[PDB]
Amino acid sequence: LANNMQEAQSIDEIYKYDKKQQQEILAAKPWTKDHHYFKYCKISALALLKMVMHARSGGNLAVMGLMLGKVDGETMIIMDSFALPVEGTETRVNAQAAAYEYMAAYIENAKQVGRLENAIGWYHSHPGYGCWLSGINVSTQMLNQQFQEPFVAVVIDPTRTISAGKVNLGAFRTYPKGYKPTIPLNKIEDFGVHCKQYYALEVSYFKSSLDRKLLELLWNKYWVNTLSSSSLLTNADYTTGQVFDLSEKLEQSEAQLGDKLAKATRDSCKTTIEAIHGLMSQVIKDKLFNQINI
Amino acid sequence: IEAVYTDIIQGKLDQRNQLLEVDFCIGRDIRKKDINNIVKTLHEWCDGCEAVLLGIEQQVLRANQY
Amino acid sequence: MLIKVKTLTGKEIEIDIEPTDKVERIKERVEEKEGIPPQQQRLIYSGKQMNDEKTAADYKILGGSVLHLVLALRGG
Amino acid sequence: ATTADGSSILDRAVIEHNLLSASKLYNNITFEELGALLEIPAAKAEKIASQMITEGRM
Amino acid sequence: GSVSVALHPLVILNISDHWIRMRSQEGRPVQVIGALIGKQEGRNIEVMNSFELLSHTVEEKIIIDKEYYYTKEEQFKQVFKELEFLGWYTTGGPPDPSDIHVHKQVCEIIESPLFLKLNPMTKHTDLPVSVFESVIDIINGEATMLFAELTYTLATEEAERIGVDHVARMTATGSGENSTVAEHLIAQHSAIKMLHSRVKLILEYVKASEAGEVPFNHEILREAYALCHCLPVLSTDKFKTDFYDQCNDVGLMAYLGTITKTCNTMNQFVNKFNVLYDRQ
């Protein structure tokens, strides 16, 4: 924990809110020009944890809520998530009367304490029903996007997440009216009949310096799973798939050349860095264990 | 096989290469004056760990410099 | 009259309606200001949603009132 | 009763169990040693071993 | 001892986010204060959530707002049903008379308030989170009050476990000015450090046993012998061949992957040369 910096780190400016910049970016409205504008959604660790806990706590029923944050450039930042007092069946949720009063009161109370962020989106949980936009979510997301432009639909699946051990969070945004534009068919199948109406987004997560510092001492028995990590063995299929997509991207960039090369180089660097990190861990293990009593 | 049954050792025999591979064996009795012996070996292991740690630190420092 | 209507995302709307006037008047003010359909709108004052059947003649609005506007949302 | 080739049901069952148990303590075995371990040296040791496979039992 | 308290890995994240957000907003580090919620089952207290609280300052005294607390208590009951006020938290180091004053003021709300202390500016590897319990002793005269230290647990839900593991295994949060090599090597360094500490403790114990200053245990010594007769783990030739094969494969994967980066730099250089040097 020493021989480094302990003050405001380079992962804390993401948590800083600038009112003037947000006002300028809201007045600019760069989203209306290119409709494929937003492509990245950065969610805080706290927001994701709260969303997953609330979705799982609902049991087999469906739950819904809001999420705060802001928007910068080509990315949407989602910082906090607060639930709603909704009473939904196994398929549909309504949020009839007490949900909106809760929204207004909670936003006002949060602004009282110091929460300077505004509402940035809504989320609703599919209890084992995959991760896609239904014919009602599409309509309500279009309704929200028509007037409150900075918005995003987050879909979470609690049952599948708890059964498979991996979170299933999907960020989506709807195209406006009249916007038309051995390989698996899941690309069309896993979406509803409105597959051409909405498009997904790249979901990433971030955490603060204090978040990582406190989570470093979260538990002191994963060291065994790190020493006997067995890297380059549990994700070989991942690396082969990455190599295949990298070859496809290289072919596309070569066709274009005859700026697309930048993302291909980035993907290649990422895959190679992962492989080199795995080899480094294996070399460290070999030096630690097998180089003793020779 | 009958020694494997009593759980003193665990392993697999192999007739293709005519050898027995042992994965785990019990710790037999030790004399009073041989304890320092094992102590020495443990010390060696500790030293190795320290060395590895030092190397790692050097590496990361250099990386940051780059 | 400069009654403020605020959406949760930060949009601002200014409307002009006398207090004796019906809440349908507020509804069509926001209609001709933005265009959100009448059946897809909820308005909140003082933390309590107003009903359509209450004329704002005996109402705790004496100027400076801010109305929180939200859009109905549903999921499946 | 005898299962055709003069073998009692108990004998065949215990032979199959012995083969299954020996499959856990051996990386690989020879036919002669497998037969010396549980009688029936080679006429039906290979037959029993192959019958246990192709059925998910070994 | 006292009342067994069960802490979830969501309160601590709430406190850390609170501290980070207010420190960023105010520029300088500050002190944050809130309120915990949970359940009371017999002799067991469980804290599972927390919400922020508003506090004002009168010269030196810190006064917790009561009307805002009441509104928040009425609001949070709609979403969470079996949740009740349990205690209050703050961020700071050693206990302070300001904390005792705040606890005495807060005592007017619940009978047995807890006291969760978080250390955001810790300077050691000791646990930064400490659960304190303030029971009113029967000492007469001046109220000599020392909050009893509590050995909290880490009771956690299944979805909470999944989310906590997901955030713990996160690595893309940085990869900016700090090299990803540093982040990859830090985990290995920490794991090796903990293993080295454990083996150093074992070495110290066996040195003490051979010295004669401690009772001689015939079982632990033989267990240590069994452990120490297996450090060269799997030094067979097949393992060496597999290790060399893996190293060669990763070397090829690095070569094919440095070539493309060199080609991209090539393309950028030629593009720049074909505009800023080419004669139209």
GROMACS .gro file of C-alpha atoms in nm, chain A residues 1 6-8 11-12 15 45-46 48-49 52-53 56 83 85 102 105-106 109 113-115 161-162 165 167 205-211 213-215 217-218 220 222-223 226-227 232-233 243 261 265 268-269 272 275-277 279 281-284 286 288-290 292-293, chain E residues 9-10 13-14 16-17 19-25 52 68 72 75 78-79 118 120-121 124-125 128 158-160 162-170 173-174 180-181 184-185 188 191-192 194-195 198 231-234 239 243 246-247 250 253-254 256-257 260-261 264 267:
model
  132
    1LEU     CA    1   0.000   0.000   0.000
    6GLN     CA    2  -0.249   0.823  -0.154
    7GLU     CA    3  -0.413   1.157  -0.245
    8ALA     CA    4  -0.683   1.211  -0.509
   11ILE     CA    5  -0.973   0.717  -1.086
   12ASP     CA    6  -1.151   0.978  -0.871
   15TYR     CA    7  -1.680   1.084  -0.944
   45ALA     CA    8  -1.999  -0.034  -0.860
   46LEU     CA    9  -2.257   0.082  -0.605
   48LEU     CA   10  -2.469  -0.219  -1.016
   49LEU     CA   11  -2.464  -0.384  -0.672
   52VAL     CA   12  -2.858  -0.670  -0.862
   53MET     CA   13  -2.960  -0.687  -0.496
   56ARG     CA   14  -3.285  -1.062  -0.671
   83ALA     CA   15  -3.560   0.144  -0.616
   85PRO     CA   16  -4.235   0.102  -0.450
  102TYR     CA   17  -4.158   0.848  -0.457
  105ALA     CA   18  -3.969   1.310  -0.311
  106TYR     CA   19  -3.653   1.098  -0.335
  109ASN     CA   20  -3.438   1.465  -0.062
  113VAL     CA   21  -2.821   1.606   0.118
  114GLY     CA   22  -2.582   1.687  -0.166
  115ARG     CA   23  -2.666   1.448  -0.449
  161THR     CA   24  -2.762  -1.413  -1.290
  162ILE     CA   25  -2.796  -1.606  -0.964
  165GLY     CA   26  -2.300  -1.667  -1.139
  167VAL     CA   27  -2.454  -1.051  -1.393
  205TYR     CA   28  -1.804  -0.044  -1.480
  206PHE     CA   29  -1.585   0.183  -1.270
  207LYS     CA   30  -1.500   0.238  -0.905
  208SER     CA   31  -1.331   0.503  -0.694
  209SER     CA   32  -0.990   0.491  -0.528
  210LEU     CA   33  -1.143   0.446  -0.183
  211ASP     CA   34  -1.376   0.182  -0.328
  213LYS     CA   35  -0.878   0.039  -0.136
  214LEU     CA   36  -1.161  -0.091   0.084
  215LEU     CA   37  -1.241  -0.380  -0.152
  217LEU     CA   38  -0.918  -0.600   0.213
  218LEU     CA   39  -1.263  -0.747   0.147
  220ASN     CA   40  -0.820  -1.282   0.268
  222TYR     CA   41  -0.871  -1.561  -0.258
  223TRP     CA   42  -0.490  -1.571  -0.251
  226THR     CA   43  -0.447  -1.650  -0.725
  227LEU     CA   44  -0.142  -1.868  -0.660
  232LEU     CA   45  -0.449  -1.938  -1.995
  233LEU     CA   46  -0.662  -2.248  -1.926
  243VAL     CA   47  -0.854  -1.389  -3.233
  261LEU     CA   48  -0.705   0.020  -3.810
  265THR     CA   49  -0.476  -0.250  -3.316
  268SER     CA   50  -0.491  -0.700  -3.081
  269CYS     CA   51  -0.301  -0.518  -2.806
  272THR     CA   52  -0.177  -0.993  -2.649
  275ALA     CA   53  -0.185  -1.353  -2.290
  276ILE     CA   54   0.139  -1.194  -2.170
  277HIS     CA   55  -0.011  -1.133  -1.825
  279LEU     CA   56   0.240  -1.610  -1.904
  281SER     CA   57   0.171  -1.520  -1.374
  282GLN     CA   58   0.276  -1.871  -1.476
  283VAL     CA   59   0.644  -1.772  -1.470
  284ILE     CA   60   0.598  -1.617  -1.126
  286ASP     CA   61   0.717  -2.150  -1.144
  288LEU     CA   62   0.796  -1.937  -0.649
  289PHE     CA   63   0.720  -2.309  -0.616
  290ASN     CA   64   0.925  -2.535  -0.844
  292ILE     CA   65   1.297  -2.452  -0.437
  293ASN     CA   66   1.491  -2.757  -0.313
  503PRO     CA   67  -2.059  -0.562   0.205
  504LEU     CA   68  -2.303  -0.292   0.093
  507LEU     CA   69  -1.952   0.062  -0.026
  508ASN     CA   70  -2.217   0.321   0.064
  510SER     CA   71  -1.692   0.488   0.056
  511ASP     CA   72  -1.907   0.635  -0.222
  513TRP     CA   73  -1.686   0.996   0.127
  514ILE     CA   74  -1.548   1.004  -0.227
  515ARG     CA   75  -1.838   1.209  -0.363
  516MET     CA   76  -1.830   1.470  -0.087
  517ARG     CA   77  -1.450   1.495  -0.095
  518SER     CA   78  -1.460   1.554  -0.471
  519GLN     CA   79  -1.743   1.807  -0.438
  546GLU     CA   80  -2.723   0.964   0.413
  562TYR     CA   81  -3.520   1.520   0.747
  566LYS     CA   82  -3.644   0.967   0.526
  569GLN     CA   83  -3.993   0.725   0.285
  572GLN     CA   84  -4.218   0.190   0.141
  573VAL     CA   85  -3.945  -0.005  -0.041
  612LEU     CA   86  -1.487   0.389   0.879
  614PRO     CA   87  -1.078   0.634   0.464
  615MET     CA   88  -0.729   0.772   0.539
  618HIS     CA   89  -0.171   0.060   0.808
  619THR     CA   90  -0.301  -0.283   0.707
  622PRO     CA   91  -1.025   0.022   0.864
  652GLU     CA   92  -2.597  -1.458  -0.260
  653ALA     CA   93  -2.660  -1.177  -0.508
  654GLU     CA   94  -2.451  -0.956  -0.280
  656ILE     CA   95  -2.201  -1.214  -0.688
  657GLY     CA   96  -2.188  -0.835  -0.711
  658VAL     CA   97  -1.903  -0.810  -0.461
  659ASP     CA   98  -1.701  -1.069  -0.652
  660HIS     CA   99  -1.771  -0.890  -0.980
  661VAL     CA  100  -1.651  -0.555  -0.845
  662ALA     CA  101  -1.350  -0.718  -0.675
  663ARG     CA  102  -1.237  -0.883  -0.999
  664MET     CA  103  -1.277  -0.552  -1.185
  667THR     CA  104  -1.157   0.093  -1.364
  668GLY     CA  105  -0.801   0.217  -1.418
  674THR     CA  106  -0.204  -0.231  -1.646
  675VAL     CA  107   0.119  -0.419  -1.570
  678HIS     CA  108  -0.170  -0.720  -1.275
  679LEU     CA  109   0.146  -0.749  -1.065
  682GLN     CA  110   0.049  -1.141  -0.739
  685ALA     CA  111  -0.077  -1.308  -0.266
  686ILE     CA  112   0.294  -1.390  -0.246
  688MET     CA  113   0.048  -1.332   0.243
  689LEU     CA  114   0.188  -1.677   0.162
  692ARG     CA  115   0.218  -1.762   0.669
  725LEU     CA  116   0.823  -2.812  -0.206
  726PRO     CA  117   0.952  -2.932  -0.549
  727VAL     CA  118   0.598  -2.979  -0.678
  728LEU     CA  119   0.575  -3.190  -0.995
  733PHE     CA  120   0.568  -3.066  -1.702
  737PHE     CA  121   0.572  -2.522  -1.973
  740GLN     CA  122   0.308  -2.267  -2.332
  741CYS     CA  123   0.592  -2.013  -2.325
  744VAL     CA  124   0.257  -1.701  -2.578
  747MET     CA  125   0.097  -1.465  -2.972
  748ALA     CA  126   0.311  -1.166  -2.871
  750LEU     CA  127   0.163  -1.173  -3.389
  751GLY     CA  128   0.028  -0.869  -3.209
  754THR     CA  129   0.010  -0.545  -3.625
  755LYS     CA  130   0.092  -0.253  -3.394
  758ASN     CA  131  -0.049   0.051  -3.768
  761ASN     CA  132   0.024   0.334  -4.175
   0.00000   0.00000   0.00000
